[PDB]
Design a protein around this ligand. Structure first.
Ligand code: CU
Ligand code: CU
Ligand code: CU
Ligand code: CU
Ligand code: CU
Ligand code: CU
Ligand code: CU
Ligand code: CU
Ligand code: CU
Ligand code: CU
Ligand code: CU
Ligand code: CU
Ligand code: OH
Ligand code: OH
Ligand code: OH
Lengths: 278, 277, 278
């Protein structure tokens, strides 16, 4: 493999994070005050890393940080029940850990932390974060295994109820690549509805990485994936591989959802920057 | 050095009843007056045969239908095939299981092993809609030789918008000690899709919920979409890498968790305490 | 393996197809005028094959052909946006390609096209084909890998909203086999609803082929599979294996759906043609 690959983990990392009310009534996470986003910023670590997150709640209601997949003690689970949320104006340090896979004392195989995961609020509106998730308090987390192939770019697509990334219907988001780029997609679902994520012109493996290890990998190859609230998966594709440049739609394939605006464009450009037809 | 399942091939006999419960629910049991919702766990090894003498103590027809396991049409539990049971009647159902292996044509026949379930097929409608709603469902585990055995098995059924037909916000809660090998059988019934989530723990999305080793490509998840009659299971080490605590499990459909589809996996320290209580 | 198996692909194939309004208001695809069907005809190719489809729209509204899984250039994506649909009475040639898996220049493993796929309209009623799909413009596509086991027969089961193959409730379809037949099912979902496909007396592997490669195959074995709009999977079973002859139900296991008529029969006959009980 002459693609770039992830190194062995084991670093201690520190991060500052905020929750902020946005002017339009949404709520977002950010690494810097005044720079919150929906979805929140991507967090990327290597198996074995530890992450300490000093989280400041700048809002006038309690809020928290809850993460899927990664190791955390009960004091970092982000729930009111376990006294793990954060009062208005307060600050709390959360700790997320990750571990490599390996053989247990009893001979069984402990799975590693690697995967496409996500974080979100757990106390805004209800004790399950229903109002916080609705308002935009969610973001992606990637844990890489040593040797995983690294992409040119990562895009995050969140089906939150009947919106993509809390955007107005029929406003994408769109993103751009050049034929041949290695593009990574993190796909997260939140809210009340099931969805089916579909991409024109591209396909991926329904496994941890979205990639086949080789000719022995039995994972199915798909272009359409059912998802429900708090499901997270990811994959990498070679933009335009075997199909060329174009305005490649991605959308939820539930027909009513598609018709109501759950559609975006994967704009794959020729080496001269053009898109066939535009 | 964990305990593992032996090779199967025994003929087993079981008595089972369907009973109307005082509150209007219906449940299966191994003994009259000891019916439960979910019904009792049935556990066999690949190659075993199970003969179930089933007695319907209710005033309506009822049946037993099973997923995954081999049965002849006379044991499919449907009215169509005359395998339901009249009120007060008794019928012997036979379920079989087989090991995987090579067919004459060189193809690979899959075994019966898996996390399965049984349920009524004739109460209320000819698809068991009323019987399932009333509580006539239960788990079945078929083990492959060499499968790792747990310390304890718990059954979690999302039946419409309830867990195990319980009132909203009443669990069920389960208890373990840090380090216990805990097995979960997860079954869905009714009209709704759900997403099963556990705080602090994760499992492999494959037959056993466990990876065979470094080559196992199965994804590792903590959130699984499920629909009516889906069944899966897994094993976790309670509190592994995360410690003791009151660990929530719930459906992650936001309205469903808000409406009460939540329980607690109470993982105790060796002194019996739960951090915070 | 002394079963029949798929050969290596790499042929250029040509096909004529039509879209046709049916007397009852449905719309169907066909290989010949007056022989349209819902589902449309099965298209079956080998990895490496190319397929040129000369598609004629005989209807009074625009219509198109969009395919999942297979390689196509943007000019064959079947969307209005990319000028890829067909005006009333018009004709257009679509090209679908397939490729085998293999090693990329960077050492990564490119997945092949093989799988259980499907095609459908993309412009009737809305720009996502909502009206065309509703009316019956969908059909199965199988791409075989060299060495794949070939069945005795293939049946296509489409959960389209709350119908099977657009049929009236409680009218099947029913299929017939003899104990020991190798039967292939292509299972496609369309519309607005999620479903769970269940077959009495039989089970399959939740992987690309529905079959285990051997004792090392980790895929789960199931008899109940959740599906959403534009999901497609398939499998092979040995009719009556270990269970014998009988009227074996298949249905959606959503209780309201089976009660409302999403039920059919897999009629597995003894060598004398009878079905136990009839
Ligand atoms: Cu939670
Ligand atoms: Cu959707
Ligand atoms: Cu498409
Ligand atoms: Cu969550
Ligand atoms: Cu049934
Ligand atoms: Cu739910
Ligand atoms: Cu969680
Ligand atoms: Cu069932
Ligand atoms: Cu589309
Ligand atoms: Cu259905
Ligand atoms: Cu069944
Ligand atoms: Cu489609
Ligand atoms: O959660
Ligand atoms: O069933
Ligand atoms: O589509």
């Amino acid at each position: 493999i002459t693609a770039r690959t992830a190194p062995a983990g084991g670093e201690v990392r520190h991060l500052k994070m905020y929750a902020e009310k946005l002017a339009d009534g949404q709520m977002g996470y950010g690494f810097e005050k005044g720079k919150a986003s929906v979805p929140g910023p991507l967090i990327e670590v290597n198996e074995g890393d530890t992450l300490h997150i000093e989280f400041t709640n700048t809002m006038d209601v309690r809020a928290s940080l809850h993460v899927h997949g990664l190791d955390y003690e009960i004091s970092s689970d982000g729930t009111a029940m376990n006294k793990s949320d954060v009062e208005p104006g307060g600050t709390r340090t959360y700790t997320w850990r990750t571990h490599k896979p390996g053989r247990r004392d009893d001979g069984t195989w402990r799975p590693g932390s690697a995967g496409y995961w996500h974080y979100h609020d757990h106390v805004v509106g209800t004790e399950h974060g229903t109002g916080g998730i609705r308002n935009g308090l969610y973001g992606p987390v990637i844990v890489r295994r040593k040797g995983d192939v690294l992409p040119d770019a990562t895009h995050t697509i969140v089906f939150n109820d009947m919106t993509i990334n809390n955007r107005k219907p029929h406003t994408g988001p769109d993103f751009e690549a050049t034929v041949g780029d290695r593009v990574e997609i993190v796909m997260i679902t939140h809210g009340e509805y099931y969805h089916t994520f579909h991409m024109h012109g591209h396909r991926w493996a329904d496994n941890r990485t979205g990639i086949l290890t080789g000719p022995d990998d039995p994972s199915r190859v798909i272009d359409n994936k059912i998802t429900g609230p708090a499901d997270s998966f990811g994959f990498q594709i070679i933009a335009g591989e075997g199909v060329g440049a174009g305005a490649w739609m991605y959308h939820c394939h539930v027909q009513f959802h598609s018709d109501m605006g759950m559609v975006g464009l994967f704009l794959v450009k020729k080496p001269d920057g053009t898109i066939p037809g535009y």
